[PDB]
From a paper:
Ferritins are proteins forming 24meric rhombic dodecahedral cages that play a key role in iron storage and detoxification in all cell types. Their function requires the transport of Fe2+ from the exterior of the protein to buried di-iron catalytic sites, known as ferroxidase centres, where Fe2+ is oxidized to form Fe3+-oxo precursors of the ferritin mineral core. SynFtn, isolated from the cyanobacterium Synechococcus CC9311, is an atypical prokaryotic ferritin that was recently shown to take up Fe2+ via its threefold channels. The wild-type protein contains three iron binding sites: high- and low-affinity binding sites at the FOC, sites 1 and 2, respectively, and site 3 located in the threefold channel and coordinated by the side chains of three symmetry equivalent Asp137 residues.
To probe the possibility that Glu141 of SynFtn acts as a ‘transfer’ carboxylate with equivalent function to the conserved carboxylates of the animal ferritins, two variants, E141A and E141D, were generated. Variants E141A and E141D both crystallized under conditions identical to those reported for wild-type SynFtn. Protein structures derived from all crystals harvested without iron enrichment were free of bound metal ions, as expected. The structures of variants E141A and E141D overlay with that reported for the wild-type protein with overall rmsd (for main chain atoms) of 0.10 and 0.11 Å, respectively, with the major difference in structure being associated with the side chain of the substituted residue. Typically when site 3 is vacant, residue 141 is oriented toward the FOC. This is the case for the metal-free structure of variant E141D, while conformational flexibility at this position is not possible in E141A. In contrast, the rate constant for iron binding to the E141D variant was almost identical to the wild-type protein, at 3.4×105  m −1 s−1, demonstrating that the conservative replacement of Glu by Asp did not have a significant effect on oxidation rate. Consistent with this, variant E141D was able to bind, oxidize and mineralize iron all at similar rates to the wild-type protein, despite the lack of any crystallographic evidence for conformational flexibility of Asp141. It appears, therefore, that the charge of the carboxylate group is of greater importance for SynFtn function than the observed conformational flexibility of residue Glu141, despite the altered fractional occupancy of SynFtn iron binding sites induced by the E141D substitution.
Residue numbers in the entry:
A (entry chain A), B (entry chain A), C (entry chain A), D (entry chain A): 5 to 182
The structure:
Amino acid sequence: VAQGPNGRALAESMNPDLLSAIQQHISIERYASVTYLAMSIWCAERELAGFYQFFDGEAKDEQSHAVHFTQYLIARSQSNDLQTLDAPRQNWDSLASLMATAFQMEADTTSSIQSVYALAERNSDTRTTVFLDPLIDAQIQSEDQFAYLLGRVKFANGDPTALLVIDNELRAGQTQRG
Amino acid sequence: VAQGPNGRALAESMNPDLLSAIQQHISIERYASVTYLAMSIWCAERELAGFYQFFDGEAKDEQSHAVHFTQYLIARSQSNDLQTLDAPRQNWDSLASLMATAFQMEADTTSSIQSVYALAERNSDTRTTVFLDPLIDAQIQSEDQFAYLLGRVKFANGDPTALLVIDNELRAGQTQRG
Amino acid sequence: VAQGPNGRALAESMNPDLLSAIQQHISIERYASVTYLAMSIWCAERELAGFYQFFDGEAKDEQSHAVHFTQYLIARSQSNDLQTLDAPRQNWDSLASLMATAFQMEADTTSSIQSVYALAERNSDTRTTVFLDPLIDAQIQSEDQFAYLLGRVKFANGDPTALLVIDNELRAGQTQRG
Amino acid sequence: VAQGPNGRALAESMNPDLLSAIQQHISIERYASVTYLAMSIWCAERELAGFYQFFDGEAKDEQSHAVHFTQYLIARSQSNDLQTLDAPRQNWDSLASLMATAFQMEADTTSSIQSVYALAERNSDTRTTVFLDPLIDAQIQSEDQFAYLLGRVKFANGDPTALLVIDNELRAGQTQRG
Ligand SMILES: [Cl-]
Ligand SMILES: [Cl-]
Ligand SMILES: [Cl-]
Ligand SMILES: [Cl-]
Ligand SMILES: [Cl-]
Ligand SMILES: [Cl-]
Ligand SMILES: [Cl-]
Ligand SMILES: [Cl-]
Ligand SMILES: [Cl-]
Ligand SMILES: [Cl-]
Ligand SMILES: [Cl-]
Ligand SMILES: [Cl-]
Ligand code: NA
C-alpha cells in the first residue's frame, strides 16, 4: 500500500495540476467568504439589517464549503496548502452595486469549480467529478438565489421604501423565489 | 341496457353538439392552465415570487378542473377527445397587462361554461346543468378574486414598492378580499 | 454583470442549440403527461380503476417534471418557450397494447434527456449535466417500473381475472417490484 | 296566512300535477329499495356475500332517499300519499343480468326525477328544481358507480374466479372507480 503526499494510505494518485487547481479553489471559496463578510458589514453600516444577516450567514456557509474541499484533499491523501488571503472589496456606492458584485462572486465560484471539473475530466479523475457534482448543483441554486436578490433590488430602482421592504424580507428568511 | 359511445352502460344519450361543446370546454380549461403556467414563468423571470407561486397553483388547479370534466364524460358514457393545445401567450409589457389577460382568461372560461350550459338547457340535459352549477359558482369566486388582484395591481400604478408589497401578500396566501 | 435572454442576471451563457433542445424536452414531458391522462381515461372507460388511478398520478408527476425544467431555464436566465402540444394517442385494442405504448413513452422521455445530455457535454455545460443526472436516475427507476407493469400485464395473457388482480394491486399502490 | 293541503301554513301553492308526480316518484324510490333488497337476497343465495352487503346498503339508502322526498312534501305543506308497492323482480339467470337490471333501475330513478324537474320548470316551481338539483347530482354518481360494477362483472365474462375477486372487492367497500 502506497503513501500519499499527506502521509495517508493512497487509493489513487492525483495529477499535480489537478491538486494545485483544488488548492486554488479553496482560496477562491475562502475569498468569497471574506467578501460576504465585507458585504455584511457594509449593509450593517447602513442599517440594512436583513441584508447584514443574510451576508453574515453566506460568509459562514462559504467557509464551510471551503472546509469541505480541505476534507476531500485529506480523503484523497493529498496535501492541503492554505494560502494567503487577499483583502476583500469593501466599498460600494449603492446596494444595487453591492448585489452585482455578490452575484459575480457566486458565478466566479462556479467558474472555478467548472475549471477544476474540466481538469479532472482530462485526467479521468472520476472521484473528483463525482465529488464536485453536488457542489455544482448547489451553485445553480445559489446563482438562482443571487439573481433573485439582485433583480429584486434593481426593481426597487433605489427607492428606500422598497429597499426597506426587501430588507425585512431577508430578515424573515425570505431569500429565494420559493 | 344500451352501450354509450365510450363502451360503458348508457344511462341517457347525449346530443352530439353538446358532447362537442364539452370536449371543446376541456380544451379551454387546459389552455387556461398552460396560460397560467406561462404567467407564472413571466413573474418568476422578474423576481415576482408571490405572483409566480400564485399562478403556479392556478395552473395546477385549472388542470384539475379540466380533468373533472373528463370524468363527467366518463360518467355519461361519452367519448373523450383530448385535442391539440395551442401555445399560450408568453409576453407582456407590465404586470398590470398580465393581470388583465389573466382576468380575461377567467371570464372567458366562464363564458365557455355558460355556452355549454345553454346548449344543455336547449337539449333538456338536466344532468349537465346540475354538473355545471357548482363550477359556475366557483367561477364567480374566481372572477371576484382576479378582479381583486387586477384592481390592486392597477392601484399600485406601476410603483415597484407597491408591487413588492402585493407580491409578498400573494406569497403569504393573501389572494382574496376575505 | 450581463443580462441573460430572459432578463435576469446571467451566470454563464448557454448555447442556443442546447437551449432549443431543453425547450423541446419540456414539450416531450408535457406530451408524456397528456398521454398518461389519455391512458387514465382509457382505463377508466373499461372499469380498470387501479390503472386509471396510476396513470392519473403519472400524468400529474410528468407535468411536475416538465415544470422542473422550466425552473432550470429560469435559473439559467434563459427564455422559456411553451410550445403547441400535439393531441395524444387515445385508442388501444388491449391493456397490453396500452402498457407497451406507456413503456415506449417512458423510454422515449429518457432518450430525449440523453440527447440533451450529449449536447450539454459537447458544449461543456456542466451545470446542465449535473441538473440532468438525478432526472436520468429517476428515469431508470421509471423504466424499471413500467417494464414491471407491462411484464405483469403480458403475463396475464389477456385473462380478465388476472387483469382484475393486477388492477387491485395498482389501486393499493403496489406499482413496483419493491 | 293560508293553509296547505296537509294543514300546515302554506308558503306557496303547488300545482296538483306536480304534486302527483312527486308522490309517484316516492313510489319509484320505494320500489327501487325493495328491488335492491331482492337483489341482495339473490346474491346471498349464491354466496356472493360482498354483493349481498352492497345491495343491502343500497336498499337502505334508497329508502332514505324516498323519505327525503316525503319530508319535502311536508315542508311544502302538501299531502303525502304512500302508495301500494309492487312486488320486485326476484329471478335472474346470472349476476351480469342482475347488474344490468340494477343499472336500469338507477337510470329509471333519474328519469323519474327528470320528469318531475321538467314539470316543476313548466310551473315555475323554483323550490322544487332547487330541491332536486343535489339529488340529480347524486344520481350521476350512482349511475357512474353502477356502470362501473356492471362493467367489471361483464369483464369477468362469467368466470367464477373473477366474480369471487369482485365479490371480495365489494365486501371491502371498493365499490367505485375512486
Ligand atoms: Cl460601486
Ligand atoms: Cl440600490
Ligand atoms: Cl468587484
Ligand atoms: Cl402587453
Ligand atoms: Cl404594473
Ligand atoms: Cl391576450
Ligand atoms: Cl392497439
Ligand atoms: Cl391485455
Ligand atoms: Cl404509439
Ligand atoms: Cl335473466
Ligand atoms: Cl355473470
Ligand atoms: Cl327488469
Ligand atoms: Na385476490
